[PDB]
Amino acid sequence: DENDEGVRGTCEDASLCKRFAVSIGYWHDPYIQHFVRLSKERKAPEINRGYFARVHGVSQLIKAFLRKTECHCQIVNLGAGMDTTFWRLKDEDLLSSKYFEVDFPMIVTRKLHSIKCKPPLSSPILELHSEDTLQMDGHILDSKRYAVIGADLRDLSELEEKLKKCNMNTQLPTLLIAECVLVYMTPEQSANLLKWAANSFERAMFINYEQVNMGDRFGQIMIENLRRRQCDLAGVETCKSLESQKERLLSNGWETASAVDMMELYNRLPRAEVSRIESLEFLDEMELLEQLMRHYCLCWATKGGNELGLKEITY
Amino acid sequence: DEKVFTKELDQWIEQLNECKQLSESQVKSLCEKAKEILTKESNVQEVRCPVTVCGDVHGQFHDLMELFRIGGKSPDTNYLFMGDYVDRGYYSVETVTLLVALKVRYRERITILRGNHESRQITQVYGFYDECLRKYGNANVWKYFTDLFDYLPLTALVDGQIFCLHGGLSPSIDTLDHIRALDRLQEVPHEGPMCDLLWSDPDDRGGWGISPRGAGYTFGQDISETFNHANGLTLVSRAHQLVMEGYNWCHDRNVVTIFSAPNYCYRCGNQAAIMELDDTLKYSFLQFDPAPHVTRRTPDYFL
Numbered sequence: 001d002e003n004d005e006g007v008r009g010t011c012e013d014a015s016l017c018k019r020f021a022v023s024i025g026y027w028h029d030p031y032i033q034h035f036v037r038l039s040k041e042r043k044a045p046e047i048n049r050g051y052f053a054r055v056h057g058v059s060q061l062i063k064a065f066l067r068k069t070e071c072h073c074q075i076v077n078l079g080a081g082m083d084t085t086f087w088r089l090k091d092e093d094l095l096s097s098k099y100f101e102v103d104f105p106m107i108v109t110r111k112l113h114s115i116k117c118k119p120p121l122s123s124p125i126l127e128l129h130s131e132d133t134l135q136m137d138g139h140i141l142d143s144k145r146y147a148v149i150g151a152d153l154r155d156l157s158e159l160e161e162k163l164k165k166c167n168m169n170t171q172l173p174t175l176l177i178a179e180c181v182l183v184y185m186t187p188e189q190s191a192n193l194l195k196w197a198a199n200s201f202e203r204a205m206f207i208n209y210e211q212v213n214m215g216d217r218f219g220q221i222m223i224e225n226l227r228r229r230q231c232d233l234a235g236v237e238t239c240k241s242l243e244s245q246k247e248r249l250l251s252n253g254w255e256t257a258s259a260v261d262m263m264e265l266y267n268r269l270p271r272a273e274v275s276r277i278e279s280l281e282f283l284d285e286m287e288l289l290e291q292l293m294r295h296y297c298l299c300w301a302t303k304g305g306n307e308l309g310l311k312e313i314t315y
Numbered sequence: 316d317e318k319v320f321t322k323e324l325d326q327w328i329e330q331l332n333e334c335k336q337l338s339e340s341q342v343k344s345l346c347e348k349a350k351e352i353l354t355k356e357s358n359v360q361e362v363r364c365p366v367t368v369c370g371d372v373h374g375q376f377h378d379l380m381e382l383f384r385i386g387g388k389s390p391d392t393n394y395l396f397m398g399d400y401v402d403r404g405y406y407s408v409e410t411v412t413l414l415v416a417l418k419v420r421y422r423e424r425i426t427i428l429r430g431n432h433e434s435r436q437i438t439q440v441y442g443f444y445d446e447c448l449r450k451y452g453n454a455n456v457w458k459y460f461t462d463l464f465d466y467l468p469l470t471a472l473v474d475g476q477i478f479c480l481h482g483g484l485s486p487s488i489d490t491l492d493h494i495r496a497l498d499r500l501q502e503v504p505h506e507g508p509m510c511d512l513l514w515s516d517p518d519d520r521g522g523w524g525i526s527p528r529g530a531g532y533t534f535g536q537d538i539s540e541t542f543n544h545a546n547g548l549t550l551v552s553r554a555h556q557l558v559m560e561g562y563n564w565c566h567d568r569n570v571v572t573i574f575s576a577p578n579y580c581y582r583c584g585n586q587a588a589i590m591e592l593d594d595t596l597k598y599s600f601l602q603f604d605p606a607p608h609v610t611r612r613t614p615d616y617f618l
């Protein structure tokens with residue numbers, strides 16, 4: 001309980017940072033402006049570059065999954081926050097059969113207000129809906145192609161029930177996304193979640209972006225710093241190394257796993273992309289980026305992906 | 316008259332010590348008196364030992380207070396600062412105001428040099444502009460300080476033997492007389508001598524080299540040794556680079572780097588150091604961590 005307000009506060013942080021990078025042209029998002037204010041104080045170049053690689057990272061894995069399943073699938077964004085992926089997938093003509101989002105009721109309430117208030121958000125959902133009205137009773141928005149569910153991820157009975165209420169199909173291939181979320185719950189709770197995800201789908205994928213190599217002074221200072229913001233990282237013990245991150249996924253029901261630290265990913269970016277970004281802002285101290293990026297990772301696991309060839313997916 | 320002004324400045328120093336910023340007009344006056352002082356100062360500031368030498372502070376006010384507890388307070392301790400007073404830390408206003416206030420109050424006891432962050436363009440990006448615009452309601456104060464940075468001396472020389480500057484050496488400079496010949500009263504240029512002094516870095520590479528900073532140059536030990544022997548110097552002292560242990564010898568002790576912002580950006584975990592020089596130029600270092608400031612708010616991560 002005591003930590004939940006602080007954890008919920010992090011959604012405002014990531015949203016602010018993502019919009020700011022977008023405003024200065026790191027990537028294209030015409031939808032985030034409807035969810036969060038434009039920060040008037042800059043985020044430092046390494047934060048914006050860092051958020052870029054994170055976004056690019058997950059974006060490339062999502063595209064690959066959709067490609068391999070020919071969009072005949074489900075995507076379940078876990079701890080989605082102010083995620084705009086639904087609308088962006090609809091523009092790119094890469095929409096999955098249904099898009100599911102999950103977060104604390106408090107967060108969902110913020111997101112349902114924005115959706116209901118602003119037609120740029122609600123029309124695209126209705127264009128694809130069976131009804132002329134979006135119905136938002138409780139802390140749930142349900143539609144044909146898009147659902148937003150208010151649930152605690154640490155209570156799996158609540159989670160499963162509501163996804164199935166929103167007619168999630170167990171037999172469809174399914175990509176699940178935990179973009180900086182698992183680290184806010186206990187190691188045992190995030191294991192339960194991963195286990196359940198692996199048990200629910202014969203054909204599935206999991207993207208996990210979070211902290212890594214946290215067993216040093218840098219990681220310790222971060223832990224202490226986030227506690228000033230009343231936000232404890234309940235699952236840091238799982239953020240030991242890339243090896244433990246891959247082992248966390250395999251031990252909890254998945255057949256293959258891969259992980260790269262964010263910097264490794266940064267240096268593996270296409271040169272044309274690097275050139276575009278590095279001409280957006282000037283960063284004189286690359287060692288600051290280096291230190292930050294080595295402490296985060298992008299991991300992905302699959303299971304039952306033989307016929308589809310999900311073993312071959314890369315960022 | 317200036318009799319009244321000196322009394323008020325004591326009160327300002329008293330105020331800034333408890334991290335309370337000065338009013339808009341107060342800053343305007345302080346910068347003008349500082350301008351009139353700095354104009355009459357050389358590009359190469361000749362300093363007498365004993366002196367305590369400091370590097371990057373970057374708006375980390377409470378850690379500057381930690382610096383003073385350890386090195387002794389001004390003007391009891393003769394001080395020489397090597398720039399980078401602003402940006403990244405959350406208290407650039409208080410930090411840079413106090414250091415300027417100490418200069419105006421004790422001109423003979425404080426040397427403040429220009430760092431690469433004492434620049435218009437850089438402060439617009441790395442936090443200082445944003446801090447002034449928040450702490451005050453407009454850009455006037457940013458304007459007043461940035462206008463002043465143009466007057467900050469580029470370089471200092473301790474007792475004809477120890478050469479102090481923020482960044483490093485330049486291919487456009489062989490002698491100190493090449494330094495005093497420069498026109499420093501301008502915004503830090505993109506290229507050229509004045510630029511390189513504030514931006515350059517030493518490295519393990521032989522000779523000169525392209526800088527990964529994208530401004531100034533990377534110089535090897537052979538450049539340090541030519542410049543020291545050609546100018547009768549024993550040591551080039553500098554800041555500008557993060558060092559994990561607070562200070563770092565390189566180039567067979569021809570160069571030393573001093574970094575005085577502990578736990579840089581409130582993230583890095585580095586020690587900060589300061590270099591004391593005694594009455595006969597013998598050196599020693601004082602390592603220190605940040606002050607325990609409970610109300611300091613979080614730096615950015617990926618959340």
Ligand SMILES: *CCN(CC[C@H](N)C(=O)O)C[C@H]1O[C@@H](n2cnc3c(N)ncnc32)[C@H](O)[C@@H]1O
Pocket residue numbers: 007008010011012014015078079080081082083102103104107151152153154178179180181184185617618
């Ligand atoms: C780090 C901030 N968000 C990230 C949101 C999104 N993935 C992004 O912008 O990248 C973290 C979100 O995770 C939610 N959250 C944490 N813990 C839970 C539980 N137990 N149940 C439901 N949601 C959870 C936070 O509320 C936040 O939105």
Ligand SMILES: [Mn+2]
Pocket residue numbers: 399430431432481513554555556
């Ligand atoms: Mn510098």
Ligand SMILES: [Mn+2]
Pocket residue numbers: 371373399432555556
């Ligand atoms: Mn610096």
